[PDB]
Design a protein around this nucleic acid. Structure first.
Length: 91
DNA sequence: AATAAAAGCGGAAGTG
DNA sequence: TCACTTCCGCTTTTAT
């Protein structure tokens, strides 16, 4: 199946929803959601998953936090900002 | 000098 | 057993 962090990495590399999410330092692996448009991106994630209820950014960010222990995606001390690990990106 | 709003947090039970 | 999903309540950051 597809994992949340890959769903995000896909959009970022696609530019498919540049209005909702965007790199901050593509080299460092940091990215940021739009305060106004993040809910739309969260909705699309719930639909790709087919979940019973519609997906919200709150529930999505709740999922992201579980990646902290495993390292895929860590929270940056910047509003709506996260960071992919090197392994997720490449080498 | 306080607020309101938004963001961020995580335990617990639940779902394909 | 996974990878979240859903719910609920509390705390922190931010904007004014």
């Amino acid at each position: 199946k597809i994992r949340l962090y890959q769903f995000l990495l896909d959009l970022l590399r696609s530019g498919d929803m540049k209005d909702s999410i965007w790199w901050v330092d593509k080299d460092k692996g940091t990215f940021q959601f739009s305060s106004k448009h993040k809910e739309a991106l969260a909705h699309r994630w719930g639909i790709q998953k087919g979940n019973r209820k519609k997906m919200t950014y709150q529930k999505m960010a709740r999922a992201l936090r579980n990646y902290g222990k495993t390292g895929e995606v860590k929270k940056v001390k910047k509003k709506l900002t996260y960071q992919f690990s090197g392994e997720v990106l490449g080498r």
